[PDB]
Nucleic acid binder design. Sequence first.
DNA 1: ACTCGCGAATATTCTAGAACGCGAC
DNA 2: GTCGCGTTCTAGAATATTCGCGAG
Lengths: 95, 94, 95
Amino acid sequence: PNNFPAKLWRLVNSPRYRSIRWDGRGEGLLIDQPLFEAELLSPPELFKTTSFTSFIRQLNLYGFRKVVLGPLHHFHNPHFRRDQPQLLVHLKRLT
Amino acid sequence: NFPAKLWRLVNSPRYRSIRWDGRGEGLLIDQPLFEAELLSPPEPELFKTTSFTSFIRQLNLYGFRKVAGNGPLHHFHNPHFRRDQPQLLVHLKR
Amino acid sequence: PNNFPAKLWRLVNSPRYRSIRWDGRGEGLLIDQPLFEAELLSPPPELFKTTSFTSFIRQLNLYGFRKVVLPLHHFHNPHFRRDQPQLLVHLKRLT
DNA sequence: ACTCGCGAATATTCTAGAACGCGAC
DNA sequence: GTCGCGTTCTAGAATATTCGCGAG
């Protein structure tokens, strides 16, 4: 089972999780690290880690990278897109 | 006997801790209530084990897969364990 | 908080953690499961990340602990003995 | 500097292999 | 007497987390 991509989709898409959201084009995600730490690592639900760096490690394992051009983090994956949810099936850890 | 016991348990409102999910395609188990009323002292349906992990082993052995009172809500599902299609129960094998 | 063998040694030897202790001969450990869940699995300095006693059992077996052949659990490992800490070096994960 | 992003060890999660006793034939 | 079942204990394998750090 590939649970992490579906969980990430739920977090990004849901307006409860304000700290992690779609970017303006729906082709990447924006993360406000202080709010993320407060609402998703401190108290879809609830990661086991309290360390934002462990969450970044997961993003990287599933192929997310930072976008190159508020101190928001901006990540992207070709198979993580608002207008093409059917691509989510390709998100996997390497084996 | 286990498929029939599971069917009776999920369908019976007397046993609160194990029930159909919201869409009727899987079962929800409240572990504290299940242990309190179904594996240790609460016609009753009586398991012989007192350990929830052995019940989980039974669920897995018959092909169930993992997919709000106080504690861990477990959510299991099996394509052959179905509210509106009981005739599929014959396909359950250990 | 250090590797599982060192952590377990700390837990078993320290009287602060009442739920996990040496047996009468110092050749196995006794675990009171309700108390262990309350004091070593229930978040509010030695806390495991899991909240599940079954995951702790998985760790015990992974490092070679077995139940003593005749809740209060009694486990033993030939390399985990009160009067021989030098044996701890032989404990390995079965991987 | 300082950040990005991966290697590898450990922990956790979920499921299964196999032994053994018992109940239903 | 004989199997199938239920149970128990331990383990396989995938994921999640942790720790560390090389490259730019």
